[PDB]
Amino acid sequence: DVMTYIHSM
Amino acid sequence: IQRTPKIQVYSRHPAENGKSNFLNCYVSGFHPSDIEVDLLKNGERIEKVEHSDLSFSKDWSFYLLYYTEFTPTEKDEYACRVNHVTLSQPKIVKWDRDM
Amino acid sequence: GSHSMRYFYTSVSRPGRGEPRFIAVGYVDDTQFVRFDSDAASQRMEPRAPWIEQEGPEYWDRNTRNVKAHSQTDRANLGTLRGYYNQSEDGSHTIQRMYGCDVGPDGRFLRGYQQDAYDGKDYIALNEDLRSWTAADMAAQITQRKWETAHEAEQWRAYLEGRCVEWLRRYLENGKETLQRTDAPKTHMTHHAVSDHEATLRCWALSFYPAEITLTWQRDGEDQTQDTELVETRPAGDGTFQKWASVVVPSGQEQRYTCHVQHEGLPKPLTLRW
């Protein structure tokens, strides 16, 4: 199960 | 900098003439990921070759497996031709049944 | 013993050409089970293991939604990091991300991780505590301050200690047959004359799982890396792995040399002699 929303760099 | 591929050409099982097998070309340790890998039978590119999904190792270098089903004979020579930005000409590695 | 779940993301900018390409792959231990490719036609997370096919349509809807979001985030990141480093729009650049979790033999959470690379070099990593960041350079420190303010570590910690471990345990259960197996190496030796004076001894390990293995040569019990060649462990194509180690020895002295094979599926290490 992948990660949820990832914050931009 | 850029990292040149390590190349291994090999069979899934020790080769027996007349018995179905798989021909593998495993390229690893390279960067960037853009690469072309072709399997050759007597110098000629084999048409239907599959490959694994792009992944990479702990040091961030990429690896891929290219493969095709084949039946070894005594006469046929096989090779893997690897085209990468680090290589002025494609590197052609011959299949050795004990490597 | 222990197990792991890992996702590997690669994003590559294609200047002159179209959008950057994003490729994601998921593994449990050394077995891949899913893929997403932003160039493929389906535009869905796809199965790549028999035991993931029993997951319902909601599984695939969620994993597609989230990994598609990741792909847009990593495309945004390529232009952002090009700006950070003051690089031209002409060159191709790569963002890689690895993340996942380990569980012990009891199935309890051991550790989680998330680390990012730019052009094959470390960029920023989540620290072991899953509460702080280690940045590699000045550009990465901009990202670190952004993620500190956004409480990005909390999001990852809650995932790595929660759904990562819960869904890994589920995969290990659903794929007991594949994932909780150990395949001991089938071993043999070959022997080829180099000349009258020398010969090559090659020690083979075939058909083993997991990939972790040690091949070593000794001469009269002494560790021997002089004249030895060790190839990288390689996939057989059928879910097992292969490795060999060779040494060049004086003809007639083959008896002095032992190959030592260590693998999780071997209750005792093997010694092979020609």
Distance from CA of C164 to the nearest CA of B (A): 19
CB C235 within 8 A of CB C206: no
Burial letters for C47-72: b for 16+ Cβ neighbours within 10 Å, e otherwise? bbbebbeebeeebbebbbebbbebbe
Give dist(CA B42, CA C126) in Å, integer.
Answer: 50
CB C98 within 8 A of CB C115: yes
Beta carbons of C238 and B12 less than 8 Å apart? yes
Of C116, C113, C126, C40, nearest to C78 by C-alpha is C116
Distance from CA of B77 to the nearest CA of C (A): 20
Give dist(CA C242, CA B99) in Å, integer.
Answer: 11
How is domain C186-272 classified at the architecture level of CATH? Sandwich (2.60)
Domain boundaries, chain C: 3-179, 186-272
Q: What is the largest CA-CA distance in chain C?
A: 71
Q: What homologous superfamily is domain C3-179 in, according to CATH? A: MHC class I-like antigen recognition-like (3.30.500.10)
Give dist(CA C73, CA C64) in Å, integer.
Answer: 14
CB C255 within 8 A of CB C194: no
Interface of C with A (CB under 8 A): 7, 24, 26, 45, 59, 62-63, 66-67, 69-70, 73, 76-77, 80-81, 99, 116, 124, 143, 146-147, 150, 152, 155-156, 159, 163-164, 166-167
Structure tokens that stand for C73 in this block: 């985030």
| Chains B and A lie in contact, requiring 3 or more CB pairs less than 8 Å apart | no
B89-97: Cβ within 8 A, 24+ apart: B90/B36, B91/B5, B91/B7, B92/B40, B93/B7, B93/B8, B93/B9, B93/B25, B94/B9, B95/B9, B95/B10, B95/B11, B95/B23, B96/B9, B97/B11, B97/B14, B97/B15, B97/B72
SS3 A8: coil
Fold classification of B1-99 is Immunoglobulin-like (2.60.40)
Instruction: Give the sign of the dihedral formed by CA C49, CA C51, CA C56, CA C61.
Output: negative
Structure tokens that stand for C110 in this block: 């051991």
Beta carbons of C7 and A7 less than 8 Å apart? no
C81-88: Cβ within 8 A, 24+ apart: C81/A9, C81/C118, C81/C123, C81/C139, C82/C13, C84/C139, C84/C142, C85/C118, C85/C139
SS3 C69: helix
Q: Is C260 exposed, middle or buried (0-12, 13-18, 19+ CB in 10 A)?
A: middle
Structure tokens that stand for C84 in this block: 């950070």
How far out from the chain centre does Cα C169 lie?
19
C118 to each of B54, C52, C122, C258, how far by Cα in Å?
16, 31, 6, 43
CB C231 within 8 A of CB C205: no
B43 touching C, CB under 8 A? no
